[PDB]
Symmetry: C3
Subunit: 29 residues, 3 copies
């Protein structure tokens, strides 16, 4: 309800940027 969801949401785009890092890492120019 009231607070009935947004973190039980958004938090993967975070993991989506933590993914770009694994290649930011498995690569980086």
């Amino acid at each position: 309800h009231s607070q009935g969801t947004f973190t039980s949401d958004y938090s993967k785009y975070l993991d989506s940027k933590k993914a770009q890092e694994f290649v930011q890492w498995l690569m980086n120019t």
Copy 2:
């Protein structure tokens, strides 16, 4: 004492920047 606190401290400014991200996200231009 000796090591008697600094991480049982500082670690929220981290959460303070993780907050700017929720709007970096709940917004971003």
Copy 3:
């Protein structure tokens, strides 16, 4: 084997950059 290691690896360089932050913090110009 097959998936027999890379995360049971890489993940500290992450902590290595989280270290630069503790001084990015225990300092910053």
